[PDB]
Design an enzyme around this catalytic site. Structure first.
Site, mmCIF file in Angstrom:
data_model
loop_
_atom_site.group_PDB
_atom_site.id
_atom_site.type_symbol
_atom_site.label_atom_id
_atom_site.label_comp_id
_atom_site.label_asym_id
_atom_site.label_seq_id
_atom_site.Cartn_x
_atom_site.Cartn_y
_atom_site.Cartn_z
ATOM 1 N N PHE A 60 37.965 -2.163 55.164
ATOM 2 C CA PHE A 60 38.217 -1.865 56.568
ATOM 3 C C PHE A 60 37.514 -2.845 57.445
ATOM 4 O O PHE A 60 36.363 -3.222 57.266
ATOM 5 C CB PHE A 60 37.713 -0.418 56.902
ATOM 6 C CG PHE A 60 38.523 0.619 56.239
ATOM 7 C CD1 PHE A 60 38.448 0.828 54.846
ATOM 8 C CD2 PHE A 60 39.360 1.422 56.998
ATOM 9 C CE1 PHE A 60 39.289 1.784 54.223
ATOM 10 C CE2 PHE A 60 40.252 2.360 56.361
ATOM 11 C CZ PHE A 60 40.187 2.529 55.006
ATOM 12 N N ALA A 61 38.237 -3.340 58.445
ATOM 13 C CA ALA A 61 37.693 -4.293 59.370
ATOM 14 C C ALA A 61 38.152 -3.885 60.767
ATOM 15 O O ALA A 61 39.235 -4.279 61.253
ATOM 16 C CB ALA A 61 38.202 -5.673 59.020
ATOM 17 N N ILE A 62 37.338 -3.088 61.401
ATOM 18 C CA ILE A 62 37.690 -2.420 62.673
ATOM 19 C C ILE A 62 36.788 -2.984 63.689
ATOM 20 O O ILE A 62 35.597 -3.281 63.464
ATOM 21 C CB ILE A 62 37.579 -0.860 62.443
ATOM 22 C CG1 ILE A 62 38.559 -0.401 61.367
ATOM 23 C CG2 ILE A 62 37.852 -0.008 63.749
ATOM 24 C CD1 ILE A 62 39.933 -0.338 61.750
ATOM 25 N N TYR A 65 34.195 -6.071 63.272
ATOM 26 C CA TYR A 65 33.993 -6.352 61.812
ATOM 27 C C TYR A 65 35.135 -7.201 61.276
ATOM 28 O O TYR A 65 35.030 -7.701 60.121
ATOM 29 C CB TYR A 65 33.855 -5.074 61.015
ATOM 30 C CG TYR A 65 32.534 -4.431 61.087
ATOM 31 C CD1 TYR A 65 31.771 -4.307 60.006
ATOM 32 C CD2 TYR A 65 32.053 -3.889 62.291
ATOM 33 C CE1 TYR A 65 30.465 -3.772 60.033
ATOM 34 C CE2 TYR A 65 30.786 -3.307 62.353
ATOM 35 C CZ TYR A 65 30.007 -3.251 61.197
ATOM 36 O OH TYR A 65 28.737 -2.686 61.220
ATOM 37 N N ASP A 150 31.268 -6.161 55.247
ATOM 38 C CA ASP A 150 30.173 -7.032 55.764
ATOM 39 C C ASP A 150 29.374 -7.541 54.571
ATOM 40 O O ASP A 150 28.152 -7.312 54.466
ATOM 41 C CB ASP A 150 29.288 -6.229 56.766
ATOM 42 C CG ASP A 150 28.853 -4.977 56.248
ATOM 43 O OD1 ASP A 150 29.380 -4.236 55.372
ATOM 44 O OD2 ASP A 150 27.724 -4.650 56.680
ATOM 45 N N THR A 182 17.906 9.962 49.945
ATOM 46 C CA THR A 182 18.339 10.488 51.285
ATOM 47 C C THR A 182 19.638 11.238 51.286
ATOM 48 O O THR A 182 20.533 11.030 52.091
ATOM 49 C CB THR A 182 18.417 9.333 52.333
ATOM 50 O OG1 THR A 182 19.325 8.334 51.877
ATOM 51 C CG2 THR A 182 17.005 8.714 52.502
ATOM 52 N N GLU A 240 28.752 8.518 52.910
ATOM 53 C CA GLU A 240 27.886 8.276 51.761
ATOM 54 C C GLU A 240 27.260 9.554 51.293
ATOM 55 O O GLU A 240 27.121 9.753 50.049
ATOM 56 C CB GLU A 240 26.876 7.174 52.082
ATOM 57 C CG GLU A 240 25.907 6.885 50.906
ATOM 58 C CD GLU A 240 25.054 5.752 51.352
ATOM 59 O OE1 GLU A 240 23.941 6.019 51.900
ATOM 60 O OE2 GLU A 240 25.381 4.602 51.077
ATOM 61 N N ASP A 263 21.122 -6.588 48.630
ATOM 62 C CA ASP A 263 20.769 -7.141 49.968
ATOM 63 C C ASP A 263 19.570 -8.080 49.789
ATOM 64 O O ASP A 263 18.444 -7.517 49.650
ATOM 65 C CB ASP A 263 20.483 -6.006 50.944
ATOM 66 C CG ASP A 263 20.139 -6.520 52.384
ATOM 67 O OD1 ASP A 263 19.849 -7.717 52.552
ATOM 68 O OD2 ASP A 263 20.374 -5.659 53.247
HETATM 69 O O1 LIG Z 1 32.791 -0.870 63.822
HETATM 70 C C1 LIG Z 1 32.904 -0.725 62.576
HETATM 71 C C2 LIG Z 1 32.029 0.067 61.823
HETATM 72 C C3 LIG Z 1 32.266 0.167 60.427
HETATM 73 N N1 LIG Z 1 33.305 -0.571 59.838
HETATM 74 C C4 LIG Z 1 33.702 -0.448 58.428
HETATM 75 O O2 LIG Z 1 32.840 0.572 57.777
HETATM 76 C C5 LIG Z 1 31.986 -0.144 56.871
HETATM 77 C C6 LIG Z 1 30.638 0.672 56.822
HETATM 78 O O3 LIG Z 1 29.927 0.389 57.878
HETATM 79 P P1 LIG Z 1 28.677 -0.646 57.929
HETATM 80 O O4 LIG Z 1 28.954 -1.816 56.896
HETATM 81 O O5 LIG Z 1 28.413 -0.947 59.386
HETATM 82 O O6 LIG Z 1 27.503 0.318 57.348
HETATM 83 P P2 LIG Z 1 26.076 -0.260 56.825
HETATM 84 O O7 LIG Z 1 26.433 -1.121 55.556
HETATM 85 O O8 LIG Z 1 25.492 -1.349 57.885
HETATM 86 O O9 LIG Z 1 25.138 0.940 56.715
HETATM 87 C C7 LIG Z 1 32.025 -1.547 57.473
HETATM 88 O O10 LIG Z 1 31.685 -2.369 56.239
HETATM 89 C C8 LIG Z 1 33.461 -1.806 57.776
HETATM 90 O O11 LIG Z 1 34.186 -1.841 56.475
HETATM 91 C C9 LIG Z 1 34.153 -1.340 60.588
HETATM 92 O O12 LIG Z 1 35.084 -1.945 60.105
HETATM 93 N N2 LIG Z 1 33.944 -1.402 61.941
HETATM 94 O O1 LIG Z 2 19.231 5.929 53.103
HETATM 95 C C1 LIG Z 2 20.563 5.512 53.027
HETATM 96 C C2 LIG Z 2 20.876 4.250 53.976
HETATM 97 O O2 LIG Z 2 20.161 3.232 53.310
HETATM 98 C C3 LIG Z 2 20.364 1.990 54.109
HETATM 99 O O3 LIG Z 2 19.351 1.119 53.466
HETATM 100 C C4 LIG Z 2 21.768 1.577 54.258
HETATM 101 O O4 LIG Z 2 21.540 0.454 55.159
HETATM 102 C C5 LIG Z 2 22.557 2.680 55.001
HETATM 103 O O5 LIG Z 2 23.929 2.330 55.078
HETATM 104 C C6 LIG Z 2 22.363 4.034 54.188
HETATM 105 O O6 LIG Z 2 22.831 3.793 52.841
HETATM 106 MN MN LIG Z 3 28.033 -2.314 55.112
#
Ligand SMILES: O=c1ccn([C@@H]2O[C@H](COP(=O)(O)OP(=O)(O)O)[C@@H](O)[C@H]2O)c(=O)[nH]1
Ligand SMILES: OC[C@H]1O[C@@H](O)[C@H](O)[C@@H](O)[C@H]1O
Ligand SMILES: [Mn+2]
Length: 285
Positions: A60-62, A65, A150, A182, A240, A263
């Site tokens: 997803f690329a919204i 993104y 991302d 968590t 999640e 990461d």
């Molecule tokens: O404005 C947004 C927010 C989320 N995402 C989608 O949802 C995923 C999960 O969100 P994100 O990667 O921001 O979560 P994080 O990895 O930073 O916790 C993103 O990879 C995109 O695939 C998106 O496309 N647009």
């Molecule tokens: O605690 C869970 C969280 O851990 C972060 O490190 C991750 O950036 C979030 O997307 C969520 O997975």
């Molecule tokens: Mn992500």
């Protein structure tokens, strides 16, 4: 029906020597935990090519993104299921912002327009609904892999991951005790998990399986999210948290090690990781 493998020459597996002594390579329910060293990719490639396996990849690329798609897709071409049939499904609010990436033979990309939600939480959570494209996937692919955008591929991600259902160890929690996970801890949420339960903490950004099992998972997580919404509660980590509850109660048939979602800026390159295969791209949340 599966025809015979051809003759192959490779090193004999040695029963009285483990491939890895530093890590758990099989779960207590007998699912492999996939690390480098545990698989011979030539045997696995033969097994899957003889079935003419097609793998779907959803992303997803919204909103903003869309800027991540070029690197995601170009690096997927170098490292994700090369040699196999791949169908990318790019879900976006901006079909015109999808970059024109050159694909190898046997690989295709579909752009699927969806609506954009305002809150980044709803964007991330509503992927379960959107995935559960049901009839189309059954007709077009054998497995579905569902990932965050991302990200970039830096090393091989191949058919060693494929199985009826998998999750991936979250890179921040793979050495953690379960009470530190968590998980959602409020009993009023469908995602709730008590402190004395839990096998692993799985990452919401990389899960998959056969189409049937992925549609079961995403339908069940979307229904559980709807129940929470109707109850006025949003799980602590959104989709999640629901994926963690689902995989506690429906054990995955393989678990991917954190090689598969890492990461480097936040966690470096520990010695237990021989390869960093799919890694976060730095961004400003
Ligand atoms: O404005 C947004 C927010 C989320 N995402 C989608 O949802 C995923 C999960 O969100 P994100 O990667 O921001 O979560 P994080 O990895 O930073 O916790 C993103 O990879 C995109 O695939 C998106 O496309 N647009
Ligand atoms: O605690 C869970 C969280 O851990 C972060 O490190 C991750 O950036 C979030 O997307 C969520 O997975
Ligand atoms: Mn992500």
């Amino acid at each position: 029906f599966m025809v015979s493998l051809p003759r192959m020459v490779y090193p004999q597996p040695k029963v009285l020597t483990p491939c890895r002594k530093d890590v758990l390579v099989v779960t207590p329910w007998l699912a492999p935990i996939v690390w480098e060293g545990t698989f011979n990719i030539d045997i696995l490639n033969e097994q899957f090519r003889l079935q003419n396996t097609t793998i779907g990849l959803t992303v997803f690329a919204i909103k903003k993104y869309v800027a991540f798609l070029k690197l995601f897709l170009e690096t997927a071409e170098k490292h994700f299921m090369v040699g196999h049939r791949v169908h990318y499904y790019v879900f976006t609010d901006q079909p015109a912002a999808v970059p024109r990436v050159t694909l190898g033979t046997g690989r295709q990309l579909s752009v699927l327009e969806v609506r954009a939600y305002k809150r980044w939480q709803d964007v991330s959570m509503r992927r379960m609904e959107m995935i559960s494209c049901e009839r189309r996937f059954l007709s077009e692919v054998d497995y579905l892999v569902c990932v965050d955008v991302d990200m970039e591929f830096r090393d091989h991600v191949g058919v060693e991951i494929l199985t009826p259902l998998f999750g991936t160890l979250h890179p921040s929690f793979y050495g953690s005790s379960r009470e530190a996970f968590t998980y959602e801890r409020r009993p009023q949420s469908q995602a709730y998990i008590p402190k004395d339960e839990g096998d692993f903490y799985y990452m919401g950004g990389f899960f998959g399986g056969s189409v049937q099992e992925v549609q079961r998972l995403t339908r069940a997580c979307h229904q559980a999210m709807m129940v929470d919404q109707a109850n006025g509660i949003e799980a602590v980590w959104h989709d999640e948290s629901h994926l963690n509850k689902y995989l506690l109660r429906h054990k995955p048939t393989k678990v991917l090690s954190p090689e598969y979602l890492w990461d480097q800026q936040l966690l470096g390159w520990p010695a237990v990781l021989r390869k960093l295969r799919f890694t976060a791209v730095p961004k400003n949340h």
